[PDB]
Amino acid sequence: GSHMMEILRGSPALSAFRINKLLARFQAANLQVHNIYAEYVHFADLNAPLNDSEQAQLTRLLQYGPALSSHTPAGKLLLVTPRPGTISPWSSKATDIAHNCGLQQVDRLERGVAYYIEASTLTAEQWRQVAAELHDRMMETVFSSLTDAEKLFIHHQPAPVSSVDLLGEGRQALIDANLRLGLALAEDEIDYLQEAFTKLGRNPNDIELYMFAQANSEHCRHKIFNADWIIDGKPQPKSLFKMIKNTFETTPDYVLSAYKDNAAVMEGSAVGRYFADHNTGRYDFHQEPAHILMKVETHNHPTAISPWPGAATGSGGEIRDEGATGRGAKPKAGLVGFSVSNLRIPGFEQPWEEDFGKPERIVTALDIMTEGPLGGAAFNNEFGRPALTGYFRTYEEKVNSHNGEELRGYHKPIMLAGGIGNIRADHVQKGEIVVGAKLIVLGGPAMNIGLLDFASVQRDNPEMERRCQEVIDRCWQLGDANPILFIHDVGAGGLSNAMPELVSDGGRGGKFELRDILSDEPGMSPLEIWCNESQERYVLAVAADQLPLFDELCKRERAPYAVIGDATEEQHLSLHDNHFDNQPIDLPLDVLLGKTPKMTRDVQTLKAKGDALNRADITIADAVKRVLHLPTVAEKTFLVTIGDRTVTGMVARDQMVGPWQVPVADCAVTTASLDSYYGEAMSIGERAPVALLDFAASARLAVGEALTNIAATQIGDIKRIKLSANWMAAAGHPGEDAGLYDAVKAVGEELCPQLGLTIPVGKDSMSMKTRWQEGNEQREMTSPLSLVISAFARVEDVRHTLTPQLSTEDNALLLIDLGKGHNALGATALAQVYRQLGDKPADVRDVAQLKGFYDAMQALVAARKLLAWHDRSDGGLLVTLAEMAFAGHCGVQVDIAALGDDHLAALFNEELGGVIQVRAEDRDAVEALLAQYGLADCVHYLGQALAGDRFVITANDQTVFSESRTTLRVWWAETTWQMQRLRDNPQCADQEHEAKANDTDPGLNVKLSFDINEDIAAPYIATGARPKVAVLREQGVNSHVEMAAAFHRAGFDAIDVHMSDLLGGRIGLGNFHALVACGGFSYGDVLGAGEGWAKSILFNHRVRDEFETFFHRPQTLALGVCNGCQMMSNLRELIPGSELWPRFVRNHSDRFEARFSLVEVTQSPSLLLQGMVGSQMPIAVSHGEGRVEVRDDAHLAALESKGLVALRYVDNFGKVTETYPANPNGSPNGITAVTTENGRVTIMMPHPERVFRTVANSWHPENWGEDSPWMRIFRNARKQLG
Ligand SMILES: Nc1ncnc2c1ncn2[C@@H]1O[C@H](COP(=O)(O)OP(=O)(O)O)[C@@H](O)[C@H]1O
Ligand SMILES: [Cl-]
Ligand SMILES: [Cl-]
Ligand SMILES: [Mg+2]
Ligand SMILES: [Mg+2]
Ligand SMILES: [Mg+2]
């Protein structure tokens, strides 16, 4: 009706490398395309007119991104847009910016990509193939006109509820609905529904059946995990779930919550929890217990269909699980896992890989590993949690396993996302839901999502979830006045699961109004509103008298919320519809949550034969090369540098280790607070291919490896370590059900209670198989049983963590071989890379000795007797030693004669254990310590790390294997090289790869022009006079807490200043002498990073004036970091002395870069870098749009001549660099900070505030104390103010 759509043209959309890729793709499909050009195009659906000033504002909002060369359009237009009926996340954010800039006339903004294709005459046939290359069929459509985008904004009238005519047709009505709605109901569930509605005397509504079906799936009831079993004809006494709970019955130690919430909780440490007070707005430390929550989800089916959103919402859903623990809690750090079939990277096929086909309807393993990590990282980056540990396994082979010869793999992948958080002691327990409590949906509007498998295409808006987390944080930060009585995440089933679960958990019923739920799709039916799986939502209960407070909190964060119902004493569920004046749902809860009896699974053991490894084509040298090329083993950088590892300022140990930043850390460690050396650790263990031979061994190894990956961290009591067990299986596949029972028993009833390990959380995914028609033949690809164990623990001292970085001081390398010389080769990387399974796999060989291992390591860690540790896992001792030599950038000389005559088995078995490095003078003491724990016969002196490039393995006087360590390290890098090369700018991928081949690279290294231990602010702090700093944040910012903390340590009173506070008058910048614009992803970077934030200031004349006035005062200081640097660069019209500043645009890599980068401080006016000029030291970088862009060389030369460049990326050799990733973003002349003429304003891309604490620097010199060099910036600001 009365809307009108405006078209606004945008910038050129693809860089020269992406255009070439497209042209090459067209060439290789024999489509004669001579040229292709693309522009972004924007569509504004308007509800009232724009005046000229508004219109110019909207046009300006929509000019963003890198200044790529524009061209006059020519050839055939193909416009790609989101498909009609969908709203992109880009839309949600861009429209929020328009609204925050005072353009309420904009109902919605949407974007497309206009492609202009010049081709020979192409059949309509071939035009469709061109169009297919240019869009994602699961999310987008192609139009032939710009005006066709009107279809994206059509207003549809609400669809009414539909009843299913049980009373008029009998059981057939329920049968028909089952089919037509895809309810997947069993016979006995159809019976139950028939009887329930017969008793009620009325026809069920569609919404009620849908809801019921969502509540009664195998999964939502966990029928398998609660089933009775009979195994080989004997009834078993416990369900799988009871056997897991056995670990809690045996070891309840330190557990605060298990099996009754959205996450498990264990005891943490008493530390200073740092946040801004509700009454003052000032950041302060609050000394109190910070207890530790933990959870791990999977998202396997959606990732097979659309991997980017599948992975993104796997992380997003898990983050809501965390925030909705107890009465509200705070995510801290994440972990990520993938298992896929063989990559078969074009031009880099490996000799074990065979193409077995796949279903047409799923994506490939390569597409999952291309798009899926980017999705997981998009959510973690934009929400703001660091991703600090993970796994990635490839497996796809035709093997003689439990059910004979068949294809085993991961066409349906594992996509795993988990994390830890912190929680207050008084919020661990869910509160009572008082009768009459208000029932609220916190979060995003509902769309028709989760209802070609379009129903499995998810959608992520992380910035929305950050806004909600800020509200959750405000609530828990009120302590006793936290108004959240009860909270739950919204996930599977949408509100139709979440609301009834919330009321039911509190022993209440609810009454709801459909029309009070926020919706962005007015066409939706009641079923679609109630049951859709739209993201970034939470449900909670609050007392009516707390609404004004909750409203204030949400409005300050710009977090949408709706009060949608009231908790009732009666245990009934009612949903009313004010629009249709009727009652879509009217049910007793016991009807809905009544569910018929348990399952019995009556099953049989199948055990694989086992075939000795045929070693005809195997040599040691060839094996080394192959194994280094297995993705499971190979360097993981493509999965690591795409995800932030520094947000919060609490990351102590990330994946990257040492001066050469080699991703081999065995576990993650965070600090518990910004004022403590207590912390938390996370590790993973998994060994699925072993399950093709021995189900229970595979489970024991997952537990064992979690422990060996965590063991060189200072924990103490093994009972401190708590596990998530995520069970992936093809239930019903022959042999798999008995295997599953045996595996759960092996860990739940046996190994975990014996070791003293609790499993207080877990999940299950029980249809891990794919079937399709290939020739005329039915084909199937079935996963091994795949247990993933994640281990979580309180850490006693983060400073004492060891890594695989070898020292070349005089040393001894000692193998701890928990295999006890079994040296198994079955189901190893070695076997896999020669297309075999082998005979007998590794296993836990001696439970006492595994515990003894852990205890001995804990003793050695606490006594500081270890130089390094690296455990043995995929690729064996060979890979353990190789990875240590890579991390230490050195050689090894080791002898293996004591490990058996079979050198292949000694080097490549994947038995538990690993290598410790000790000082030579400590070898005897360490061996005696290990002997005290019962390990003497498992312990073997191997030799030593030596300076240089030789990787040497001997056995008596024979050389078993010898090769350049650089050669091995480059082979090991080739997979990440190839993935980066196909996914990112290939020039950057090549530069990064090639740098690894230069052994003379000295690694990160420091030069200091000042005393980093000299607190120049101390005389000021000692007065007790603390100037304020405005810690400025906009919606989506994430790095404000640690920014506050850095200024706090330098003597400031850090004030939380939201952009909403400046709009509402609750703060005025006239009361401040210092302001800092913080990092993150304001508005998700939509409309260009920092742009929405800056233009919200520029387009509100009052706030614009406020900023201009602050910056023109003679003594004020300002700092902009990351998103803040971008924001300040985007309103330089307000900042004196800033006329030569550049813009900050998409990195040359075309990828987010989370790096620990070397920079030098350069001479400039900057008052914040006084005393530091000439210093060189690393700094945290975490950005996608950090590349300095200038208008032309005139501009660059002027900026440089003016002397305003304050930081530059250098290589490890100390030279100013544009080579990647030493310069991570492509900025000319390495530029990454600039200042104004007077030196009072400085802006920079890297994050000094994330690394002001030495313990939070991924690598640093051993002689540093608590302060890193970057503390000096904050101290300089304090001293300058005087
Ligand atoms: N999917 C992933 N996402 C992020 N980090 C990962 C991922 N997979 C592996 N990593 C990290 O890369 C490094 C090497 O991984 P891997 O060799 O699987 O570990 P390990 O063999 O010690 O179990 C580790 O620091 C690990 O946390
Ligand atoms: Cl499925
Ligand atoms: Cl070092
Ligand atoms: Mg490994
Ligand atoms: Mg390891
Ligand atoms: Mg592992």
Side-chain angles (χ1 to χ4, degrees), residues 326-328 426-427 429-439 475 480-488 502 506 539-546 550 567:
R327 298 172 55 223
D426 293 343
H427 299 156
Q429 292 313 312
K430 301 277 203 219
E432 276 125 60
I433 301 186
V434 295
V435 172
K438 302 295 193 172
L439 307 180
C475 290
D480 292 341
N482 175 1
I484 300 178
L485 302 179
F486 200 106
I487 181 165
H488 199 298
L502 177 150
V539 298
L540 58 88
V542 313
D545 71 3
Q546 296 307 306
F550 193 75

Side-chain angles (χ1 to χ4, degrees), residues 1196-1212:
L1196 180 60
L1199 173 63
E1200 287 287 2
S1201 286
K1202 200 64 180 163
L1204 303 186
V1205 175
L1207 294 179
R1208 295 178 200 281
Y1209 296 108
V1210 297
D1211 72 22
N1212 295 335

Side-chain angles (χ1 to χ4, degrees), residues 410-472:
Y410 290 104
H411 280 204
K412 181 169 161 173
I414 294 175
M415 192 285 140
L416 179 137
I420 54 170
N422 289 320
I423 187 165
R424 284 180 142 181
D426 293 343
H427 299 156
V428 169
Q429 292 313 312
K430 301 277 203 219
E432 276 125 60
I433 301 186
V434 295
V435 172
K438 302 295 193 172
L439 307 180
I440 289 168
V441 185
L442 175 60
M447 292 152 291
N448 182 175
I449 287 165
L451 263 14
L452 290 193
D453 202 352
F454 290 108
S456 291
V457 181
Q458 258 300 161
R459 176 203 193 268
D460 65 290
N461 184 355
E463 188 243 22
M464 179 67 67
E465 186 146 313
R466 164 54 61 168
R467 284 142 69 194
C468 294
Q469 180 69 50
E470 292 290 354
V471 171
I472 296 170

Side-chain angles (χ1 to χ4, degrees), residues 460 490 548 569 589 598 668 743 878 919 988 1116 1119:
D460 65 290
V490 181
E569 194 171 27
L589 282 169
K598 62 189 49 155
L878 182 282
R919 289 158 190 85
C988 300
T1116 55
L1119 173 63

Side-chain angles (χ1 to χ4, degrees), residues 82-83 86-95 108-111 447 459-461:
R83 48 177 206 107
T86 70
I87 293 168
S88 67
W90 181 103
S91 174
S92 303
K93 291 175 254 181
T95 302
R108 194 159 85 80
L109 293 177
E110 193 55 279
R111 187 170 77 168
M447 292 152 291
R459 176 203 193 268
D460 65 290
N461 184 355

Side-chain angles (χ1 to χ4, degrees), residues 336 338 389-392 636 639-640 655 663 665-666 705 709 871 873:
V336 185
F338 291 98
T389 194
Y391 90 92
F392 161 41
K636 297 311 187 296
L639 298 171
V640 174
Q655 300 90 317
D666 286 312
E705 189 195 338
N709 262 336
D871 73 324
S873 53

Side-chain angles (χ1 to χ4, degrees), residues 1141-1161:
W1141 279 8
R1143 292 313 269 275
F1144 293 88
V1145 302
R1146 188 78 175 174
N1147 296 342
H1148 185 56
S1149 66
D1150 201 23
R1151 190 64 46 227
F1152 190 88
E1153 299 292 343
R1155 302 287 186 160
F1156 192 56
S1157 303
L1158 207 59
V1159 293
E1160 70 176 11
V1161 182

Side-chain angles (χ1 to χ4, degrees), residues 629-646:
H629 281 84
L630 178 68
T632 310
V633 166
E635 200 173 17
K636 297 311 187 296
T637 310
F638 78 105
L639 298 171
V640 174
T641 61
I642 60 168
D644 191 297
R645 299 184 316 281
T646 56

